[PDB]
Amino acid sequence: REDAELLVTVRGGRLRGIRLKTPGGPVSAFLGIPFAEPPMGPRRFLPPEPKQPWSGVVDATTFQSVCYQYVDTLYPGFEGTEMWNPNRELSEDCLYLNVWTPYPRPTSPTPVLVWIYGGGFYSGASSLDVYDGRFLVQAERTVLVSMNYRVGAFGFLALPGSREAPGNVGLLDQRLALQWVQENVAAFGGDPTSVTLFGESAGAASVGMHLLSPPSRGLFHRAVLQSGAPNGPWATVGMGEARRRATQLAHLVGCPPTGGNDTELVACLRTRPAQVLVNHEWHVLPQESVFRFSFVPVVDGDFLSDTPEALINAGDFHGLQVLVGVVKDEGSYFLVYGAPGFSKDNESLISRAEFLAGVRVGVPQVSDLAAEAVVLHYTDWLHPEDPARLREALSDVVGDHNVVCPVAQLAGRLAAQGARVYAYVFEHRASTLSWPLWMGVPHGYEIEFIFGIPLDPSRNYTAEEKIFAQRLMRYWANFARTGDPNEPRDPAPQWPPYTAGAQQYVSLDLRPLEVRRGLRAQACAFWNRFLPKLLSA
Amino acid sequence: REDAELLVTVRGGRLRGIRLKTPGGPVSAFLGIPFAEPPMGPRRFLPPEPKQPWSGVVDATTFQSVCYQYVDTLYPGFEGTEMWNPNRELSEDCLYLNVWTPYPRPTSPTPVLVWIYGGGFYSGASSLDVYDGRFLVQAERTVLVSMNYRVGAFGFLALPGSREAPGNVGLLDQRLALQWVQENVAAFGGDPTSVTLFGESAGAASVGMHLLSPPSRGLFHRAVLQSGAPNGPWATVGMGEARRRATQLAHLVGCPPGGNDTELVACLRTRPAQVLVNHEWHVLPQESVFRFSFVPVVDGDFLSDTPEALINAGDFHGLQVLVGVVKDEGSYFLVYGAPGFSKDNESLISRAEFLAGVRVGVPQVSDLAAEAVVLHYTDWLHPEDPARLREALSDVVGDHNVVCPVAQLAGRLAAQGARVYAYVFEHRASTLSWPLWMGVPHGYEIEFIFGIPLDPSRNYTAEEKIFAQRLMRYWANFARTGDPNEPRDPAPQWPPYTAGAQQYVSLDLRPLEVRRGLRAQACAFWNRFLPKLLSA
Ligand SMILES: *[C@@H]1O[C@H](CO[C@@H]2O[C@@H](C)[C@@H](O)[C@@H](O)[C@@H]2O)[C@@H](O[C@@H]2O[C@H](CO)[C@@H](O)[C@H](O)[C@H]2NC(C)=O)[C@H](O)[C@H]1NC(C)=O
Ligand SMILES: *[C@@H]1O[C@H](CO[C@@H]2O[C@@H](C)[C@@H](O)[C@@H](O)[C@@H]2O)[C@@H](O[C@@H]2O[C@H](CO)[C@@H](O)[C@H](O)[C@H]2NC(C)=O)[C@H](O)[C@H]1NC(C)=O
Structure with a gap:
């Protein structure tokens, strides 16, 4: 029965x-x-x-x-x-x-x-x-x-x-x-x-x-x-x-x-x-x-x-392990939802005038001065009007402001105040991705690999991606049961903790782990350290 | 008689x-x-x-x-x-x-x-x-x-x-x-x-x-x-x-x-x-x-x-201008008041000295303006490396006082009728008595423009003499015709500076090389953003 x-x-x-x-x-x-x-x-x-x-x-x-x-x-x-x-x-x-x-x-x-x-x-x-x-x-x-x-x-x-x-x-x-x-x-x-x-x-x-x-x-x-x-x-x-x-x-x-x-x-x-x-x-x-x-x-x-x-800055985080990360192109998804000149169906090669207008859409409700600071930092003044560069710059604006720099501040303060932190950037563009090529590795498209969806026979992933998905599931489960994504298997390489000074993270793609420095350190200093001072003055 | x-x-x-x-x-x-x-x-x-x-x-x-x-x-x-x-x-x-x-x-x-x-x-x-x-x-x-x-x-x-x-x-x-x-x-x-x-x-x-x-x-x-x-x-x-x-x-x-x-x-x-x-x-x-x-x-x-104001409002058609800077406009002044600096050591300053230096090199500005300077001139992957801090504070003083005022003058004259020629002077004199860390300091191109190396009682090299003769010829070409270029091809030619292409040449013992931007990133800060900040 x-x-x-x-x-x-x-x-x-x-x-x-x-x-x-x-x-x-x-x-x-x-x-x-x-x-x-x-x-x-x-x-x-x-x-x-x-x-x-x-x-x-x-x-x-x-x-x-x-x-x-x-x-x-x-x-x-x-x-x-x-x-x-x-x-x-x-x-x-x-x-x-x-x-x-x-x-x-x-x-x-x-x-x-x-x-x-x-x-x-x-x-x-x-x-x-x-x-x-x-x-x-x-x-x-x-x-x-x-x-x-x-x-x-x-x-x-x-x-x-x-x-x-x-x-x-x-x-x-x-x-x-x-x-x-x-x-x-x-x-x-x-x-x-x-x-x-x-x-x-x-x-x-x-x-x-x-x-x-x-x-x-x-x-x-x-x-x-x-x-x-x-x-x-x-x-x-x-x-x-x-x-x-x-x-x-x-x-x-x-x-x-009312x-x-x-x-x-x-x-x-x-x-x-x-x-x-x-x-x-x-x-x-x-x-x-x-x-x-x-x-x-x-x-x-x-x-x-x-x-x-405030709670992050004030907190004692001893005894806590966290794993944090971002995808390579955090900002691209959202541009097709209102930034002028943007579409998933063309190359979204915007003009300078559309870039300046996009800045106010992606950094909404800040002073004209604050918007000027964003344009200063994200314009390349040797190529202020190149449409391809303007497109990536607006993506970086939206991506850094909403995801990368908030994650980086969290990662940095938790590390400095007692936590073991591990940080990644996810850099594989899935073979099955239906967004256009200019959007890169868009926000949300690491989830399917973390969840092992490529093992679904009903789907058409490559064999590399199945191996990749198995790799990520292990890091995640290793972190889940030990607080450390690493496995006693030194060559693998190793994934080092993130710290406020060294700022080490690993790239997650088909190739083996590669250690790097800084979650857009230069950009995030603008968002995390300078821009708050400006908005209260 | x-x-x-x-x-x-x-x-x-x-x-x-x-x-x-x-x-x-x-x-x-x-x-x-x-x-x-x-x-x-x-x-x-x-x-x-x-x-x-x-x-x-x-x-x-x-x-x-x-x-x-x-x-x-x-x-x-x-x-x-x-x-x-x-x-x-x-x-x-x-x-x-x-x-x-x-x-x-x-x-x-x-x-x-x-x-x-x-x-x-x-x-x-x-x-x-x-x-x-x-x-x-x-x-x-x-x-x-x-x-x-x-x-x-x-x-x-x-x-x-x-x-x-x-x-x-x-x-x-x-x-x-x-x-x-x-x-x-x-x-x-x-x-x-x-x-x-x-x-x-x-x-x-x-x-x-x-x-x-x-x-x-x-x-x-x-x-x-x-x-x-x-x-x-x-x-x-x-x-x-x-x-x-x-x-x-x-x-x-x-x-x-x-x-x-x-x-x-x-x-x-x-x-x-x-x-x-x-x-x-x-x-x-x-x-x-x-x-x-x-x-x-x-x-x-x-x-x-x-x-x-007068630069912005001017009709500069009919004007030829030759402008330029040395490679290290800021180093000289540092030993006259920046904390931690001396011509007698390496001036490998600390982060705290760098921050204090910023208020000396950018005097009379609000705390917010100073913070904006620190943001731009900090390498946030290396915020405390003393050699990078020495170089960065030299850049603050040089950009704020010389390079970026010159870049703004050049850009606006060029966009308003003038023919502009820009250079950076990159040769450190064999005879230079300032320490190596100061690079090519403010003022040390003058002796080459006046052809002082030709004076035999002084200790310049043979190739420094040829260099002085090159520079005297550019300057005198410019005075005679408004064009430094030797009216003859190889060259490379010295192209005019423009607000878009931003082209200038480097002057050293090597032949002319053309480059783009008089520190365009830093001078955007000093020329475009900082004025807005000091207003509001
Ligand atoms: C890229 O596309 C945008 C979006 O326009 C829509 O999507 C296109 C792919 C196509 O299906 C168009 O018919 C759609 O209008 C273009 O920006 C639009 O431009 C039109 C006028 O040309 C304007 O009415 C809309 O408001 C604009 N939309 C936005 C979001 O700004 C853009 O011009 C295209 N880029 C090109 C062709 O280079
Ligand atoms: C590099 O030199 C500066 C300047 O110091 C002066 O010149 C030196 C050649 C030597 O004669 C020093 O004794 C002189 O004071 C040093 O900065 C000074 O440091 C002293 C203490 O060491 C301090 O009392 C002064 O306030 C400093 N002066 C300034 C302008 O900041 C600096 O320490 C030297 N760097 C070294 C030694 O690494």
């Missing part, structure tokens, strides 16, 4: 999973485990409530719904954008997580990788094909967990101080899932004393906010931040700007029938169909921009007691 | 010159010709007055007195500083000029070169050995004129608005000599319709100011600006700060103070010249290198606007 490996009792009740075929052998998957009560109706915008115990057996046999979110339509049918779009029905009933474990279940406690997807805090899902945990768990014999968390207004609309919309509830969704991991992962063979968070972009920023929030920090041990940081200019928002955005969203959908009582304002928002909120989400941004999202974590003293910058 | 070639009648009266030897043949020299009434006593600080005629024969066989000035004492007896110090007695009776001419004197109109010496507007003299005109005149058959002009407070103390100390009188000293050239150079064989001005440091700044002042502009036809420009942060001063400096000088020497300019000048006019000199450095507002107390003042008269 039943297979005992696919039957697990967690604190809330009994579950039943499925046996997954993988290239390397069987895996057990428990997909769509409810960890919170559904945040519908009166519970919209509220902190997650833990799932109430149930009698009988819950079937955890497929991914559950995607949290309600905007759906990208810029290049309809284009795989390079469709791969990030929801692959399940949209619902507010979306607080489910997924556990993958070896078959048979490990005998001794196994280290746990917990994945947190990105999507700008406005999109994403744990169900996307590229986040398929079966290949890591098979190849490296870890337990892998991933959760859904609310995005957009449903996760991050904030009327700060208000009780019916406190903000950051999507982060509370993540923390609740992490608490579930502590109470329940042992039932699957996982070690709750060896839990490594990892995430990418907004998921990397989320990992960092759990590092900086004491109530989250007791729930994990190690951290991996791929292409994102809590201190990025896009990842948090101030209390007053959160209130302005929430209030203008309400105003754009009829509430109140501002007033927070109770009455939210109650009105709660009567609007979810899709009506999503249809107005982008209209609350203060300007024309790229790499800016409407509802993101708010710095209000609760989750984050201070800005991520 | 007497030599006819060395007797000359100028509008003021009669002169007796002297024959000079060179290894290429004789030249005729007329040294110490008075062109102004001695600006003494009641005429201290006033505009110069033309020399009243004389009877008899003025003896023009010897250099005349040096205008009263500070004497460098940083390294007593050291050749590298002594060569710039006065080599004749000091006197306020110093307004004389010198003419060198071929022997026998030309009988057709010969192109004229007019030398204006540098010295920060606080020092200098036309009699310095390194400014000896005999080799250029023999080798390139030009007429060469140089004049003394008042420096320090005597030339540039300004109480703006006052008739008793108007300012810029040293500049007027220069203009009066240019007028004297127009009226008298033909008596020596010179062609008053082909006058090329050239000068170095403060002399190059002086040249640029005559370019931008209409009453001077009809007195010459082309300009050479070596390692200086009128828009450099040091070459001019605002009316308010000029008044504050003149006023503190009066305090420091016992003069007052409802206030009154007439009385303050009158009390200054009673002090011995040396007393003013003794307090000259103490009116500067802060510790600094490359700043000088009494410089040209922008008051709407000699200069009706700032030089940067």
Whole structure:
């Protein structure tokens, strides 16, 4: 009648999973485990409530719904954008997580990788094909967990101080899932004393906010931040700007029938169909921009007691290992979403005039003086108008400002204040990539190799890329169980720690590890050391 | 009996010159010709007055007195500083000029070169050995004129608005000599319709100011600006700060103070010249290198606007300009106040010294501006490497004071009608007494332009002599035609500088090599960004 490996009792009740075929052998998957009560109706915008115990057996046999979110339509049918779009029905009933474990279940406690997807805090899902945990768990014999968390207004609309919309509830969704991991992962063979968070972009920023929030920090041990940081200019928002955005969203959908009582304002928002909120989400941004999202974590003293910058600088990080990195062309994806002259369908060889206009789109809402400093640093004054150079320069502007330099500041301060840090740059352009050649290794395209997707026989990767993907999974799993991506296998070469002075990182591509110095050191000194001084003067 | 070639009648009266030897043949020299009434006593600080005629024969066989000035004492007896110090007695009776001419004197109109010496507007003299005109005149058959002009407070103390100390009188000293050239150079064989001005440091700044002042502009036809420009942060001063400096000088020497300019000048006019000199450095507002107390003042008269303003607004069609810099404009000044520097060690400074140095090399700017300097000149892969910090602070001082002011002048003149030729001078003299770490310092191309290597009693190499002959030929080609290129191909040709291509040549023992950008990255900072920052 039943297979005992696919039957697990967690604190809330009994579950039943499925046996997954993988290239390397069987895996057990428990997909769509409810960890919170559904945040519908009166519970919209509220902190997650833990799932109430149930009698009988819950079937955890497929991914559950995607949290309600905007759906990208810029290049309809284009795989390079469709791969990030929801692959399940949209619902507010979306607080489910997924556990993958070896078959048979490990005998001794196994280290746990917990994945947190990105999507700008406005999109994403744990169900996307590229986040398929079966290949890591098979190849490296870890337990892998991933959760859904609310995005957009449903996760991050904030009327700060208000009780019916406190903000950051999507982060509370993540923390609740992490608490579930502590109470329940042992039932699957996982070690709750060896839990490594990892995430990418907004998921990397989320990992960092759990590092900086004491109530989250007791729930994990190690951290991996791929292409994102809590201190990025896009990842948090101030209390007053959160209130302005929430209030203008309400105003754009009829509430109140501007501002007033927070109770009455939210109650009105709660009567609007979810899709009506999503249809107005982008209209609350203060300007024309790229790499800016409407509802993101708010710095209000609760989750984050201070800005991520301050908490990073103040923190004692002894006993912490982190792995951080970026892709080679962090900035190119976002240019086709609004920078003038840019398209995935031509070479985007912009003019000087379009470059100067792009600077204000990619560095939005800074003084004319601050914009001048950006143009000074990124113009090559022996070739101020060469279109090819202007295209790469604008990519560097957006990439450095939003990802590389925030990651570099995080890496540097954690190292200087007690953490062992490892840093990479991912430099392989996947043979299957559908974006144009000028975009390089675009943001987000290391994930499929980390997750071992090239081992999927259904896909058409080269054999080199399969070997490469196996290499990355090992670094990640080695870091997960030891805090060090290196393996006692000296030639391999070795991946040295990142430090504030030497600033060493390794390149990840088909060739063997190559050590290098400085995460765009010259550029990041402008973003991390000089530009803040200028904006307060 | 007497030599006819060395007797000359100028509008003021009669002169007796002297024959000079060179290894290429004789030249005729007329040294110490008075062109102004001695600006003494009641005429201290006033505009110069033309020399009243004389009877008899003025003896023009010897250099005349040096205008009263500070004497460098940083390294007593050291050749590298002594060569710039006065080599004749000091006197306020110093307004004389010198003419060198071929022997026998030309009988057709010969192109004229007019030398204006540098010295920060606080020092200098036309009699310095390194400014000896005999080799250029023999080798390139030009007429060469140089004049003394008042420096320090005597030339540039300004109480703006006052008739008793108007300012810029040293500049007027220069203009009066240019007028004297127009009226008298033909008596020596010179062609008053082909006058090329050239000068170095403060002399190059002086040249640029005559370019931008209409009453001077009809007195010459082309300009050479070596390692200086009128828009450099040091070459001019605002009316308010000029008044504050003149006023503190009066305090420091016992003069007052409802206030009154007439009385303050009158009390200054009673002090011995040396007393003013003794307090000259103490009116500067802060510790600094490359700043000088009494410089040209922008008051709407000699200069009706700032030089940067006048550069931007000018129609420079019909102008040919030759401009350039040495390879290490900043090194020299570092040993005069940058913490950690000496000509006697390697000056391998620390990061803390580098940061303190930045406030000395970029004085009187906001903390934000200084931070922006540190951002640009730090290698953030090597923020504390002492050799890189020494080089970077040299670059800060050189770019801010010379290279980038020259690049801006060149770019805007070229984009507004002028034909511009740019060089970087990259040859370290075999005879150089400054340490190796200073490279090719400020001022050490002059001796090659004047052909001093041809002097056999000096210790230059045979290939250094050929180099001097090359440079003299470029300079003289430029004076005769507005084009340094030897009108003949291999070459490579020296192409004109333009705001886009930014082409210049390097001058060393190797043949001409063409390069792009007078430190375009750094000068974008100083010329385009930093002005915006200081406004807001
Ligand atoms: C590169 O493309 C952009 C985007 O234009 C769109 O995409 C093209 C590939 C093509 O499908 C066009 O028909 C589309 O309009 C071009 O920039 C656009 O230029 C048009 C006018 O020419 C203007 O109306 C749009 O606003 C512009 N869009 C943006 C984002 O600026 C750009 O000119 C193309 N570059 C070339 C052809 O060199
Ligand atoms: C390089 O020299 C400077 C200048 O020092 C002076 O000149 C030297 C030749 C020697 O005679 C020193 O004693 C002189 O003071 C040195 O900078 C000075 O250092 C001393 C202490 O060593 C300090 O009291 C002064 O303030 C410094 N002066 C300045 C202008 O900063 C520097 O130490 C020397 N570098 C070395 C020795 O590595």
